[PDB]
Design a protein around this ligand. Structure first.
Ligand SMILES: [Cl-]
Ligand SMILES: [Cl-]
Ligand SMILES: [Cl-]
Ligand SMILES: [Cl-]
Lengths: 444, 430, 430, 444
């Protein structure tokens, strides 16, 4: 061990560690979940990018000296490129409003930067975690800026998955365009529709979230960096470094506690979860059986069965999706509570908030990808079973009204229900023309 | 048109002459018009408040020399409210701020003015019966209100218990009716092994039986009250009087500084209502699923029709009672979240949000009792089994091959039946 | 006296005078759950009457509905649109049937009022038939979800006005307190100085954002499935003229059939406003705490009386009422989420619960913000001296001395000030 | 790698893996969260105990040959003892209602049993994951039994944490018995109490939870294991786990009941509610040091800035609040899973058990950390506490018998306007202080 010192006193730190005393304290202070900052690596990379922006802004503004600027920029590039992730060890449930994550960055960046200067660990007389790495910065504009960037960095995985699942539902809508089946309202047999229309409707509801997701995420572009001249500078560098176009917030006093964008964005994750769960529930119900459920579609069998129980297909991929959806809805309540609990000039609970949102983005992204790839793409229609449902439709009797009158049609409907026959069968047996029914049964 | 002029610490105001409420209730009416839902929409809380006032008046008469003429006028007024009169005078919004103060004050003024009337004196004659000095003697909001909240919940228990027992009985009787009705069990919505529809309905009963005892045990936490914590002889006596008036044995909290902010019992009780709603909604869901069809769904049961259907669409029975049950359960779950937030938001020596809490829990209690009542009476009691459709499900079971094991080769009969579309009774002859 | 009426289930007696019929009476018995009737959400009743007017006009214009019956029906619709006959809308908001009983409650009331217009008695359904005439060309699954969306559209102005009123109130105080120096607090610890005016402008700013978002999300409700073709296209055009909103037919009926996305998104914007509002109210309760042993930075107008012996005690009742409304709206949002998630195939059966929760939450929030603005924010006063003292006792001020005397020296001045009660300017002046 | 086969086909498995083909399919089917079964080791140990119980009953009933029993039992013992955790790889968000957890155990146990027999992995004709390890078992009795057992095995850690925090608050209630301060109701100065009473109230509310937690956890003791064999398996499982279990009476009810998970999650929620409130109070009482309430000092556990002395961010209570919001969110996740049961099974117990075990761990550590790193070291600002009590306007009431109500109120208003105490005003008008200092006496 090497021995380090901060304002509280002395501790012994593994020489193998790139983190320093303040991080070690945080590890014992907030050991709560065995979930560390490295399990949310987007926040780590965002933290390294903000630090680079700030070193550059200090350098160009003559504030920070030139050998320091350059060793620290190197160090940040190292992390941005995915090195030293295991050095990010503070619990996601950390108190301190982001301070412990800021410090974990500052200290790791300092040590790494020393190691670029051929100097040993803890040599903070050369590169200081606070004095240098943190120069012109405080946690209350750094951490909120890095949270927003982490979410901006994470948008693409969600968008890609959503588009992929939309495409999968679209393809099946085209494949099943000719597959007639019975619509069901309140789970009672309704009027004929196509299975293709049902799948196209899964696509269409989700298509509505793509643009909305993008537009709410754009709210995160408005950042408070340099909120304590230097500010305008750091923001410019952060835009180039991150590859995302950022802008200074119009109101700093408003921004200091504002969690509004976090609430809106979580609310769209929630909205996608609600739709996705309903769709998964439909898939489980449509594939019920194989003999005594609806038996309208077959899902790909992705888990092995028993030779003596063939035809049993547990709809495990939709089940996993349902679970992710319930989790996302609970995590949204978690975010609501943290957001509601802000006080005066700060919300202290952004670490909780960013952990729940990034987690929910991961969960939903993966669930949609799995749902498309390991289920939707391989769904097959039981064409004959779908047709049987539509042809047994009591609603077919309504197409007889023009020709025979309401009362007689209703009497033909009653006779069909009683005798187990199709409306067409009952119409035929009466010496009637059932041509209008044929039209109700035409997907085209 | 006539008014009388009243005064409080904020100033003077004109009050409609015949109103039994006074200046402070009038201010609360102006201040908290938020939902159009007034205190008289939760009459249990109004009755409970009147019980508390009566208990306090009796203790003041016994121990603190409240004059007999005031005492008897005041008690007569509380009795009237307890018995359902003057409910329309309880006009403050259930969303009122003030942690219950405006509810206390609505009671104080109405009781004062109704007492005055019993003494043949005019409204507003507060030198004779004073809302604060007489009706509120020895009390403050901070012991009167939480005590009245606890009492209101206790007085409302029996309506939920009765309904739960009614629904349980309904389910038990169909479990007997359906004991010989064989059908296919379904797991993860896949055809599984045969069960009876009787067993299915008895399981709906069984899960609800677990709730009756838990409900009484949690409700009994409400018996510990902080009444008289404002003013120990007075306290002890007011509680003895309140137990007598209410017919429920109550006790003093042993720790008043703890009792001051404590909402634990509310959260636990809201929690059991929530648990009951989760089970009931699942059961409603099952009923809607089992009655799907009549041709292209499950079609295993038929629910009684309670609203007319279309003559051209015979057989269609929308499961409207279970649907109304689902909506009530989603309301209760949401209300439980409202309670959780109010509860978590207490500060130091008070939770300011008990008006919201008591409003939500009483509402949820009424909603649940009536949903369970309606489910039993307007749905469960008339449920029919489509016995031959149930049978065909069970006889179509591939699980039946497993029985054949004394003949592996059984797996080949199962494979043949699946693809052939025939039963495992049909394939095994051959 | 009662009149006798009949439907497909049988006969019932109806109060002679009632404008509702047998179908509505059945619904009263079937769904008696909450004691909250359709008349408690009058925007839905008005919207139903608009949809019934538009359908009658379409039907008339296409030769399906005779002139005298059309004209009497439209006049009956107009009466209800004005608020007449609200008391005849008696069906519980927790009704099952996905909106059927609401549709029928309208059909029967409009039939009987049109019959009155033609000088006929109640129940003369031979002249005007609730189903055949008033519900001509219509079904629940198009009429009700259309009327839900329209009710939501007609209810926008109230929330928008409330929100603008509140923003205006905070903006005014932001200017008035523009020079009131005070101490910022982060994590509840003394931070760096700010102005009280900035604190209030920020409340305005955060709520300004919600205004455009509210309008944007509300536009989504214009896509309706009414009439799901000569009839369909005519009905929407008539409904757009009647309602003064430009409505568009949905392009995907199979998708529209179960879609609740817009309800969830709307409820979500109410939830966000509530989150923000509650935080603001909590801020107001904290800043006005005391008056001597709290923060004491501002005084809320006293709106509810106190005891003259306890002066300076101002319970923050308006913000408290606001917190309660916010907690309710968040719970109601969970209720909407559960209902939206529980859609099945070609219908969501739970729109009656969704529309009730969203309309209630809108009314509560609108009233909460109007009250917060008028009865609290407008009268707020700064304690200028107590504010300045907090800013004067800020240890953070020592940071401005770093360039003057260097770190170590500035930090010992900081340290000396802490350990000695005195301010940074006091210790530096020595 | 080695090649295995199941009823769907063949996969190659890394040669050093103890899991088999069915687990490998599960990793592919349900990669969603990057959180594997090994992050909830109590369920791993429960499953191993259930498998040990089943092998032993099977053996004693002469259905499982001696050498297979001995090897299986040895393998289960290794897992109960904490070996092979890393082989439990299936995502917590797995579909299949538990199947993949059951199969993960069956495969790992079979292979480890093979190692005890000196046989290679994959030799399933010697020890078969399904025919031998899963003999007389199905997912739908084994999984929900293991879930109930996991929650029972995790009770002690939460009870220990709760008792620790109660004891920390009790000791401070004793320490602060003579510290008078001003009560606050609706955030307004009310009447004096003691700081000691305030801390004893924190203890007292949490004490009500200890007994109820146990009585609710007792509900998990009723298991559906086996539903002769069944009774015997439960007797064994009780012995193996050291927790007394009993067979459920109704198997058709038990098949879908999630009643106990909802009640238990509700007690975790109730605890979170009380704990967050308490943490809110600690953060408020320690606000300042100068322009807050400044009544107590929390231990400084996070390094400060030398030029901001006096700033003590309440980081431990803040981490507690975050945990409490997570627990409330998780509780909603459980409610949705529980409500979404259908017919003879609830498909979502994997999600339920994960949320509940995570919530148990979070709360247990939060409460431990609050006691040890915060409450034990809290100190009173005795003088500031006393000043708050002495400036209480309520004091004017004690003068009513001396000067009458009216004159008492004039002094109250004057105190308020001058900023003086009621005693200072009283003395200034030549009135006796006697009555006042009685209402400021900690003995009441
Ligand atoms: Cl991440
Ligand atoms: Cl009530
Ligand atoms: Cl309305
Ligand atoms: Cl665990």
């Amino acid at each position: 061990t090497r021995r380090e010192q901060d304002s509280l006193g002395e501790r012994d730190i593994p020489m193998d560690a790139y983190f320093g005393i303040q991080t070690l304290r945080a590890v014992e202070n907030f050991s709560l979940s065995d979930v560390a900052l490295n399990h949310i690596p987007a926040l780590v990379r965002a933290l390294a990018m903000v630090k680079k922006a700030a070193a550059t802004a200090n350098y160009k503004l003559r504030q920070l000296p030139e050998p320091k600027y350059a060793a620290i920029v190197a160090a940040c590039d190292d992390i941005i490129d995915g090195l030293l992730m295991e050095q990010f060890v503070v619990d996601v449930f950390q108190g301190g409003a982001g301070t412990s994550s800021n410090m974990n960055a500052n200290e790791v960046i300092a040590n790494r930067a020393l190691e670029h200067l051929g100097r040993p660990r803890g040599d903070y007389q050369t590169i200081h975690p606070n004095d240098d790495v943190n120069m012109s910065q405080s946690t209350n504009d750094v951490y909120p800026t890095a949270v927003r960037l982490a979410l901006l960095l994470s948008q693409n995985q969600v968008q890609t998955a959503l588009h992929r699942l939309i495409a999968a539902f679209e393809a099946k809508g085209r494949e099943f365009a000719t597959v007639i089946k019975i619509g069901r309202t309140q789970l009672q047999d309704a009027v004929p529709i196509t299975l293709g229309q049902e799948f196209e409707a899964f696509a269409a509801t989700l298509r509505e979230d793509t643009a909305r997701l993008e537009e709410v995420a754009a709210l995160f572009r408005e950042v408070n960096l340099g909120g304590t001249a230097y500010a305008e500078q750091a923001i410019v560098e952060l835009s180039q470094i991150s590859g995302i176009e950022l802008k200074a917030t119009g109101n700093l006093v408003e921004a200091s506690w504002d969690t509004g964008a976090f609430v809106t964005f979580s609310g769209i994750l929630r909205r996608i979860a609600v739709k996705l769960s309903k769709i998964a529930n439909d898939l489980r119900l449509l594939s019920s059986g194989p003999r005594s459920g609806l038996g309208e579609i077959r899902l790909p069998a992705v888990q092995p069965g028993s030779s003596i129980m063939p035809g049993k297909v547990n709809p495990v991929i939709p089940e996993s999706v349902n679970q992710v959806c319930y989790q996302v809805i609970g995590n949204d309540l978690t975010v609501t509570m943290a957001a509601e609990s802000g006080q005066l000039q700060l919300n202290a609970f952004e670490p909780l908030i960013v952990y729940n949102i990034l987690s929910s983005m991961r969960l939903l992204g993966r669930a949609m990808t799995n749902l498309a790839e390991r289920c939707v793409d391989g769904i097959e229609a039981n064409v004959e079973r779908c047709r049987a449902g539509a042809e047994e439709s009591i609603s077919l009797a309504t197409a007889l009204v023009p020709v025979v009158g309401y009362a007689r049609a209703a009497e033909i409907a009653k006779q069909a229900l009683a005798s187990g026959q199709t409306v067409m069968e009952v119409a035929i047996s009466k010496g009637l023309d059932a041509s209008a029914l044929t039209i109700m049964l035409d997907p085209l």
